[PDB]
Ligand binder design. Structure first.
Ligand code: ZNH
Ligand code: ZNH
Ligand code: ZNH
Ligand code: NA
Ligand code: ZN
Ligand code: ZN
Ligand code: ZN
Ligand code: ZN
Ligand code: ZN
Ligand code: ZN
Ligand code: ZN
Lengths: 157, 157, 157, 157, 157, 157, 157
């Protein structure tokens, strides 16, 4: 069913954000794991899987609308070297991605692609869940100090 | 069955205390939860449900005695901004509520309303349990310091 | 994540509505229970719990958006003295709340808060559910008479 | 297997009767449901399903006999606006449809289409069950009065 | 609850669309079954049931909003005589229904009927899934040829 | 119970039809099995068992009516040498037997042997079932070609 | 534990190969799924998961050896527009990655990194299995024709 060409462009843009976040959150998780921070490995691994499922939804919707999914261009990752920098970089990526989502949701409504809009609002709700987690962990680092925070990451939850 | 006018006034006063405590302990719980202090969310949530059950008991006892439960007037909440301030706020509210309970329990005995007295003594025993938990947490904050105390709240118990 | 000031204001207004409805539907339920109308007690009790769940959603959303939930201001309850008057007061309260909800849904869309909007639409569906039950019970009273209606409330459904 | 042209015409006429009944029964059931008359919704919904199954049998038998099922021409519904008017309209529709069935059964026998005759007789047995229930409900309304009758419909049976 | 007049007209127009598709997809299913194409009978039967469930949702919504569901005016079926023509005809019907849905969803938003809007978006998501299936089957016919395609329909999946 | 002489004659005529079909179906089944067309073996074998059960019913009815079942005279089998010729021969046989069944059914009715008539109508329904399957398979051969059709018979269903 | 710089460079080059393969096989799978070729979607999806597991192993090995996994540079995908072209593209990518693997396995032996060598031989056995499946499917297309091949992909195996 042929979709609106700009909707497809947005979906490819948002797919590009997911591709970045898949890789950044997967590398972060295994860096946490190598450091023995098991609680952080588990959550970041999960977040990477969530982004993978978001990418799947975009790819399928692009194909249904008769566009070409763009998995070739990968935007810039910002890996970071310590726990706090890694989480802050993940939050920055989510905040930028949420901005792109809100723009695309309003456009899809304007051209009456209400199914694409509904799918994106569901994805946005997941992203705001990630933002909440990231902000909350960052606040805990500053409330209990980095050393107490790291001790709390050794065991799985 | 027509109850004593002053007993009903006490029951409406005690109900008004429970109404304040429902709202205050529920908001504190969700604040702790937003900060990632799952252990404190769990306890405060269950204290809120306790006050909800006490409120029910007062409402039904007032209606049985042919009075009008007053759920319109809501006393002053003291929310607070940090963990220790919130816990001290809840403790002050329980201690004030306990004095009101002691006064009503003695008066109910004076007019031979022994069923209301027995109901209130059960509620007072519950409140002294909250007091115990609150005082003990405030002491733990002093003995181990706030940073260690907050680390101990990240996971559920 | 910082929210829109007016959206937070709307969420606090909608929360204020839920607080009125919690108290009014809970008291109505126990009045029905004291009169031995178990069927009406059960439904009104479950409507009250449902409003409690809506309040919880507003509180957690306001907090994530970094606002202050207002559980201190409590609007006017209209309790009523007979069955039909109580149901009509509950209906009027739901209708006012649905008006406020429609206004906040339109506005959350205007500022691209699509998650708050999606949350509120789910709540509006619950309220329309309550409206339908209330209207239908009021029609049954006119169609079968109050006496037959009351007789049908004695047993649980 | 090529059937008799007139038998196919009769099956299409009866299929038309069923299509009217499917819609009228279904709308009546949801009107009963909206009014809180749960007992009547349950029965009328299941009568609708019965007519649906009858329509399927007509459709498959016309196709087997190499005719064209006519689902395009919908006859006249008579909805009605109160309970008794709705039940009497269903009864009239059934009585008309049983008259048509008797004609078709006799014709199918005279052209030796004994399988189509046997199918129609089983369908007529179902319609006669529907006539029985409808006549009985209408008598009950007269014997106990509309108000008592409506009270009896509130709960599912 | 008194709904908006033009929303009710939209809901009745969309209900009409579903009524057409109920009949067309059921007749096509039994045609396929009579030809021994069991796989096509199974899908088209469950598309019919899907449209029946949508029509139920429109009827209940209209009644809640105090409108009159219109099950009397049946639009034009286009049945067709071979497999490709029947699938193309189902696809044409779905695309016309989706156009009507987009228009209605826009309007319901403008009058703040967000529950009706949310209902329609869910139905639209179902229709776009049907469009996907139909387009894919029609492509398979071209890619593998009609004879190979028909052979693959003989067994249930 | 002494039955009508001409009914017994018809029952023996119908029994004779079944004896031919039993042998013809069974041989065709095992020819299909020998060719590796397992799907056709399964169906034809079960058509054979079905005619055996019809034969058994004729034999018991005749004996009850105090006639002599005739298993001695075996009408003409037409075996055929390729799949399509075999299916056409079965279809011709069934169509001839349905003709006799209609004749017998009309006569049993005229002599008031309603139990024999009812028995025959149940058997006629079974035969029209076989006719339907045979016609459909012959149509599938035409629509997909013999080569594709034979490939679809290799595996059991 | 400090790894050999050139081993880490090989591990990062092989990880790059898997990253291309993850994206190409996931997109190919969803294209097959959108075309209704469920058997091809299922295999290609599971090939993508295989390459994801391979990437996880390279990432963890590199981190252990104290190097930096490179998830930022994405090599060239070659998507293609029809089944045979897509399968041939996957086969070419696998054969390139198998050459790189042979080169890295030989070098890890030379520097005595036997654990990395062992890891890579396991990955090589997996890739050789993929090569086998791809070559086999491409041969089946030639032997039976594309139309017959496509028909065989419609149902899941
Ligand atoms: C890009 C694009 C992409 C996409 C779309 C995806 C998607 C995906 C999906 C859908 C899944 C399933 C999950 C669930 O459960 O649901 C997965 C899994 C997955 N994954 Zn991934 N991915 C990807 C990439 C990736 C990468 C790049 C990596 C590495 C780095 C990965 C690693 C992974 C893992 C490990 C897993 C799991 C596996 C198993 O199964 O175990 N991955 N994934
Ligand atoms: C005021 C008055 C009042 C009263 C009387 C009450 C009471 C009550 C009761 C009885 C219950 C049940 C539980 C148990 O038991 O377990 C409840 C639940 C409850 N609740 Zn609530 N509430 C109230 C208010 C409230 C509020 C205001 C809120 C918010 C804020 C709440 C929230 C709640 C919740 C969340 C819950 C749970 C529910 C469920 O189940 O889920 N709530 N509560
Ligand atoms: C017309 C033509 C027609 C036909 C033939 C039919 C048929 C039918 C059948 C066969 C079935 C199944 C049954 C049983 O199994 O029990 C049904 C179901 C049915 N259906 Zn329907 N339909 C119809 C129409 C219809 C309409 C129009 C509607 C609406 C109004 C409906 C609604 C319905 C429902 C709701 C159901 C149930 C569904 C389910 O599955 O859940 N429907 N359906
Ligand atoms: Na009465
Ligand atoms: Zn995501
Ligand atoms: Zn309490
Ligand atoms: Zn609510
Ligand atoms: Zn019927
Ligand atoms: Zn539909
Ligand atoms: Zn037979
Ligand atoms: Zn690989």
């Amino acid at each position: 069913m042929k979709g609106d060409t700009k909707v497809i462009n947005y979906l490819n843009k948002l797919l590009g954000n997911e591709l970045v976040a898949i890789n950044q959150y997967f590398l972060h998780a295994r860096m946490f794991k190598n450091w023995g921070l098991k609680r952080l490995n588990d959550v970041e691994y999960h977040e990477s899987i969530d982004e993978m499922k978001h990418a799947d939804r975009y790819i399928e919707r692009i194909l249904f609308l008769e566009g070409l999914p763009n998995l070739q261009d990968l935007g810039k990752l910002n890996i970071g070297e310590d726990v706090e920098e890694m989480l802050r970089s993940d939050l920055a990526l989510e905040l930028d991605g949420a901005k792109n989502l809100r723009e695309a949701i309003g456009y899809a409504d304007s051209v009456h692609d209400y199914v694409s809009r509904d799918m994106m609002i569901e994805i946005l709700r997941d992203e705001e869940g990630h933002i909440d987690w990231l902000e909350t962990e960052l606040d805990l680092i500053q409330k209990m100090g980095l050393q107490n925070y790291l001790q709390a990451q050794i065991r799985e939850e």
